[PDB]
């Protein structure tokens, strides 16, 4: 409620970017899809997926028990949601999966571990399966990165975000290892995804996807 409201204040085009992730999954997988949610946190993208796909099986995983406890509370009464404590770097669940989704999590990995993860994700996707990332992305240059930062700050100020939460936000972003969206899209092609695309973008934040065969 307050947490979800705060995420909208901190994330430019939250509805467009998380909404695009939901819409592209809904147009790519069945009603009864098996979906892996990597770095699920409180399960915010999971909640948006459940609203669109009431019959989908969600497996939420994260390295943080504390974050997954928030996801457990959110989905307390949902018998089609499982929770697994697992780092991105730990062995993935067997599969197959119709979709693997992630929001604002994969940027925390070293670049080589991102490329390895994309390869490992495709292995657990059925043919026609989709990988979707709602991601913090780096500008191609230092000058454009400053412009990305100004536009992010403009949203946070316009959204009337508490100064203490924005302060906390900037501190958490120090541990992020973002790269530009086109590099990551090319990495999906390198990983053997036949199609990769940026569906939606608001400067620093982008929704991109890869398809396993289609
Ligand atoms: N190496 C790693 N393996 C697994 N989870 C990781 C991780 N590095 C970061 N995370 C998780 O990634 C999340 C980033 S915050 C995003 C949370 C949620 N997907 C949302 O959109 O709101 C946190 O829950 C953090 O614990």
Numbering used by the authors: 16 to 229
What does the paper say about this structure?
Here, we characterize the O-methyltransferases BelI and CysG, which catalyze the initial step of β-lactone formation. Employing techniques such as crystallography, computational analysis, mutagenesis, and activity assays, we identified a His-His-Asp (HHD) motif in the active sites of the two enzymes, which is crucial for binding a catalytically active calcium ion. As expected, BelI as well as CysGΔN16 adopt the class I methyltransferase Rossmann fold, characterized by a core domain of a seven-stranded β-sheet flanked by α-helices. The HHD-motif enables regiospecific C1-carboxy group methylation of their respective malic substrates.
Conservative asparagine replacements in the HHD motif resulted in CysG variants that remained active. CysGfl-D191N showed a 56% decrease in substrate turnover, while CysGfl-H122N and CysGfl-H123N were fully active compared to wt but were inactivated with EDTA.
